[PDB]
Steps between C-alpha positions, in 0.01 A plus 500: 500500500605853471457807711363757257178644649471858641478382862739196463772725346440789731533293809822345351646838441434642856610172672819432296572846339540346149281351235412124493731274296271499209594873412764620271566852368446627157872508448547121611204394287652692209850334572297170411331598178185656626355750254194683601353507138559136489300416805735220593582533869378144583692376198840630610454522878241219585308568823625867536331840541650832453574704799744712684527761216510858625155690494584868464181641634522766230154671562511449881200283524693343796662665803861623485765541762873547520672164456163338388514343165234269349499166315255289315404141497262318243185337666313208376735435201520143345593519128486713177485880513499690836190608679384822692556354853785651683617543852703812551709488823729767650838459651336568844219226439211712375300255277241615251320265249371628164262291271529735221866533417572797747205726406361453850649334810364399838741478803504143640798508737 
């Protein structure tokens, strides 16, 4: 089984201060032949989900602080093209979920 639910992943983040072992960054996926247009994440990195990439919070929908940066993890991913479910977690353990690819967020941790 994998941990890849909003709540499963969020609780993993706050307890272990890292993403579950089924996450790999966009850079590490690319290193294995992942290409977004190709929809091939499961073909090159079976079982894996993208996460850990920096989320820049460009429009400030999320709260800022000095030293706080934000990161994303993909939620409910299995195969093919990526979806609209993300966690965004901050370096001091704020956790917001979005179900619409960062358009709107709800704080959950």
